[PDB]
Amino acid sequence: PQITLWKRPLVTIRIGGQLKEALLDTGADDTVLEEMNLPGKWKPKMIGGIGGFIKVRQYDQIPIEICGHKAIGTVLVGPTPVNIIGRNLLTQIGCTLNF
Amino acid sequence: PQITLWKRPLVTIRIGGQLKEALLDTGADDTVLEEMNLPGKWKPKMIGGIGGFIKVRQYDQIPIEICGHKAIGTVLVGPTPVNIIGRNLLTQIGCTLNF
Numbered sequence: 802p803q804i805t806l807w808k809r810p811l812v813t814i815r816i817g818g819q820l821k822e823a824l825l826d827t828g829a830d831d832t833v834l835e836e837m838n839l840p841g842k843w844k845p846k847m848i849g850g851i852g853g854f855i856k857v858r859q860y861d862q863i864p865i866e867i868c869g870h871k872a873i874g875t876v877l878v879g880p881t882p883v884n885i886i887g888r889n890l891l892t893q894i895g896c897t898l899n900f
Numbered sequence: 901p902q903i904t905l906w907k908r909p910l911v912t913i914r915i916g917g918q919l920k921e922a923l924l925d926t927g928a929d930d931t932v933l934e935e936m937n938l939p940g941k942w943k944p945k946m947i948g949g950i951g952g953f954i955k956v957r958q959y960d961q962i963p964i965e966i967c968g969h970k971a972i973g974t975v976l977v978g979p980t981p982v983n984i985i986g987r988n989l990l991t992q993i994g995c996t997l998n999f
């Protein structure tokens with residue numbers, strides 16, 4: 802699709818049979834989801850945003866279907882204000898900015 | 901133009917005698933610039949992201965040129981680590997997400 806920006810670019814994602822709403826976020830390198838359970842091993846990581854640093858759990862090679870498009874990649878889980886889809890997965894679905 | 905997301909979507913903006921590098925950020929409602937001593941009235945504001953909130957100064961009707969596209973709107977100035985072009989100006993320069 803083509804998505805304009807007068808509203809937040811929120812889309813439905815599928816991650817483990819679970820549907821969630823997430824924000825397409827070109828200013829985020831990484832995909833960060835609110836606290837949830839995901840299967841498999843994770844690694845403790847820290848990431849920094851506009852307000853400072855948080856602890857997250859890094860899950861690698863996780864399938865995420867984003868508005869009907871498939872990605873498989875890294876998902877960070879932790880106290881983000883909102884679910885965000887970052888560039889690591891936006892690139893996989895062929896997302897670009899255009900003006 | 902089309903901007904892929906393999907790297908951070910940094911572009912040149914101008915606000916005064918300052919050309920600056922800034923992220924084209926679809927996850928940002930508002931435009932947030934690194935500390936700069938802009939003239940005119942402003943209002944205090946708090947904005948929140950990963951890590952928590954920061955205090956910023958809200959300046960209205962500030963002309964901002966983004967990649968040779970003119971815009972004019974609200975700019976928030978404060979201790980952000982990166983200049984962020986948010987949706988309030990991205991819409992004015994005709995920016996969309998596409999996949």
Ligand SMILES: CC[C@H](C)CN(C[C@@H](O)[C@H](Cc1ccccc1)NC(=O)OCCN1CCNC1=O)S(=O)(=O)c1ccc(OC)cc1
Nearest residue numbers: 828829830831849850851882927928929930947948949950
């Ligand atoms: C609530 C959703 C987002 C987390 C909001 N952020 C925009 C993000 O794109 C943010 C931009 C940013 C901020 C600081 C440093 C770098 C980039 N990206 C973000 O938090 O990315 C996390 C991954 N980080 C780690 C370092 N580089 C990254 O890309 S935000 O910068 O916090 C923000 C919040 C409010 C606002 O106006 C009201 C404008 C911007």
